[PDB]
Amino acid sequence: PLESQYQVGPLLGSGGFGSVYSGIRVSDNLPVAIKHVEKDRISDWGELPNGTRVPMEVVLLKKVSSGFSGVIRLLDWFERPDSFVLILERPEPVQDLFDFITERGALQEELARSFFWQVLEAVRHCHNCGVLHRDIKDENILIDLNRGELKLIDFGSGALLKDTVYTDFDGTRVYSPPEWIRYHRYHGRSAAVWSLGILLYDMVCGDIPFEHDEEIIRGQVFFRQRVSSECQHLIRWCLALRPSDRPTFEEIQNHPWMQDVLLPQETAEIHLHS
Ligand SMILES: COc1cc(Br)cc2cc(C(=O)O)oc12
Numbered sequence: 294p295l296e297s298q299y300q301v302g303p304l305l306g307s308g309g310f311g312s313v314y315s316g317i318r319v320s321d322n323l324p325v326a327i328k329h330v331e332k333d334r335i336s337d338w339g340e341l342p343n344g345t346r347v348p349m350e351v352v353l354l355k356k357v358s359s360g361f362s363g364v365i366r367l368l369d370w371f372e373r374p375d376s377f378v379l380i381l382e383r384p385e386p387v388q389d390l391f392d393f394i395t396e397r398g399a400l401q402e403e404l405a406r407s408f409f410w411q412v413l414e415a416v417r418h419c420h421n422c423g424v425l426h427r428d429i430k431d432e433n434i435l436i437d438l439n440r441g442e443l444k445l446i447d448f449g450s451g452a453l454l455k456d457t458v459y460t461d462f463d464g465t466r467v468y469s470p471p472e473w474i475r476y477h478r479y480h481g482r483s484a485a486v487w488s489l490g491i492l493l494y495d496m497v498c499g500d501i502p503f504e505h506d507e508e509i510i511r512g513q514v515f516f517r518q519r520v521s522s523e524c525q526h527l528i529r530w531c532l533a534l535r536p537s538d539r540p541t542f543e544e545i546q547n548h549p550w551m552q553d554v555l556l557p558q559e560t561a562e563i564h565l566h567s
Contacts, residue, residue: 295371299327299380310449315383318368324383325368330449331376336463337452348377353448356422363415365435365446384437384444390496391432399499399518406551407560408436408443409493415445416485417542425454425481428464429488431495441561454481467491467501467509471534474506483536486545490531497524502532523550 302315305326311334316327330348339352347370354367369380390408394400400408412434419426426433428450435444450464458478462469470487473479494502498518503509512534516525527550533539545551561567 296378299325301327310447316380318380324385326381326383328379328381329376330379333375335377347372349451350448351377351379353424353451353453354379354381356424357419357448359418359422361418362442363411363444364418365444381446382444384435384439384442386438387435388438389432390434390436390443391430393436394431394496394499400496401564402497402521402524403555404560404564405493405496405524407441407555407557407564408434408496409489410546410551410554411443411557412445412489412492413542413546415443416489419445419451420454420482420485420542423454424448424451425485426451427462427481427484428468429485429492430465430468431492436565438565439561439567441557441559441565441567452481456480459484464488466506467503469509470536471510471512472536474509480536482541483539486531486539486542489545490528490539493524493531494528497528521550523548526550 298319300317300319302317305313305315307313311328311330314327316325318325335348337349338346339349341347351370357364358366366382367379368382371378416426416429426445426448428447433445433447435446437444452459458480460478462473468488468491470479470484473484491501494514497520498516502514512532514529514532527545527548530540555563
């Protein structure tokens with residue numbers, strides 16, 4: 294135990310999630326990302342399937358770990374007197390969807406379809422494991438540039454998935470649905486589908502559709518780029534004002550705009566340069 298186990302490199306980012314460094318696991322040079330979270334900044338704690346007090350983040354990552362690579366894996370974690378330290382996987386090379394979209398502007402539909410599908414798979418995977426992510430957005434998605442695979446990251450606002458109403462939220466306001474804004478109430482699935490609608494708008498227009506509580510409440514969608522009618526229809530569907538009018542994941546993945554998706558390897562060859 295302790296970090297002669299890892300070799301710390303450059304800082305990768307910091308913000309509401311804490312501080313994430315690039316790292317290398319010494320015993321086999323596996324790339325890793327080392328995430329430090331302050332105890333003071335952790336409102337949400339859980340208990341391991343076997344005993345102790347840990348941040349909910351850790352509970353949730355334990356629940357979503359598997360061979361499936363569409364969600365980031367937690368490799369290990371350590372406690373410290375004032376902080377927790379998570380060791381997570383790190384694809385290489387890599388770039389977040391926010392930078393990628395900042396670089397290339399609005400994405401061609403074929404590449405947005407392939408990215409959005411993989412997100413849909415990642416999110417289904419998390420619902421399956423009893424975990425609701427609650428902060429789906431471009432900044433919380435990583436692209437493994439070689440294989441063309443996306444990884445959902447940053448479970449720091451997640452909660453156990455439940456079928457009753459949520460009355461707390463600490464994800465990202467511009468991705469939160471109308472019923473959270475007006476009532477401070479949402480159900481998990483349907484709030485997830487709305488954030489997915491924001492996400493898809495973002496990929497295909499190059500920016501999020503709504504900046505202010507006003508526009509969220511009203512949910513009128515203006516498209517600023519050429520975007521096909523089938524893609525516009527899917528987006529307006531995810532963004533139905535009434536939660537019960539939103540599509541299920543099955544209905545999203547059966548949408549005509551979602552047919553004939555590229556494989557990740559295909560996606561990198563054609564769109565990322567392999
Ligand atoms: C820049 O931040 C990051 C870089 C890499 Br590479 C992997 C992760 C995972 C998380 C997370 O779970 O928050 O943040 C990351």
